[PDB]
Amino acid sequence: DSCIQFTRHASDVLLNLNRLRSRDILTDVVIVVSREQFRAHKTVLMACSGLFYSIFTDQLKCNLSVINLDPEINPEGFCILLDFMYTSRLNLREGNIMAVMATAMYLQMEHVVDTCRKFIKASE
Amino acid sequence: DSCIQFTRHASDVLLNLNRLRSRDILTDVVIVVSREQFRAHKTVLMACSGLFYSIFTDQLKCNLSVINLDPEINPEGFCILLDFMYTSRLNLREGNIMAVMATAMYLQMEHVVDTCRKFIKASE
C-alpha cells in the first residue's frame, strides 16, 4: 500500500498496556503459580505465549477467569516472563536463568528460550 | 536495571493482536459508526485513544459491549484509524485526510492529528 508508519506506535501501545496492568484496568484473568496469583490481560498473554494462545483459543478454556499452571513452574520465573511480555525487557540473572528458561519452554516463548540457551552456552 | 531487551517484541505483540482481531478472537466490544459496526479489543482501543481510555475507565461504560460514536464521524475515517491502532500504518490519502484528521481529533490520537496537520500545511 501507500501507508505511512509511526515508528514508536507499537512500543507506545505496549507501554500503555503495561500501565493498564499496573492499575488493574480491564485485567480479565488470574494466573496461579502455586501460592502466587498474577493478574493479566488474556490478549497480551496469547500474543506472547504459544501456551496461552492454545488455552484461550479453546472453546471451553477461553471462558475461565483463573488458570492454574503446572506446580513445577517457579513463580519468580513466571513473574520475570510476565514483565517481559508487557515491556520487552527480560531480567535475566545467573540466579534465575534456569527457572526463566524452564518457564519460557513451558509457556512456548521461543525468543526467550533462544537467548537463555545462548547465555548458558557462554558460561560453559 | 540490568535487563536485556528484545527489539522486535512490541511490533510482534501488535502483529499478533491484529491477527486475533482478524480472526475475531477475544474481541469484547462493537464500535458503531452510523450504519457500520467494528469489532475490537477494549484494551487496544484504550492504549491508542484518549477518548476510549476515558470511556473504558468509567465505572458504568467499562461494562458496555456496544459503543455508539457521534453521527458526524465518518466510518471510513474510523476504519483507517482502527487499522492504524493495530498495525502502526496509516492509510492517509488526499481523499480521506480531512475525515481522518476529524476522526483522530474526536478519538484524541495526538500523533495522527500532528501528521495530518503537517500534510495539510504542505498542500497549502
Binding site: 501507508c3 505511512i4 508508519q5 509511526f6 | 500504518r89 501528521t115
Partner: peptide, 4 residues
C-alpha cells in the same frame, strides 16, 4: 513517521 516514515515510509515503511
Amino acid at each position: 513517521w516514515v515510509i515503511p
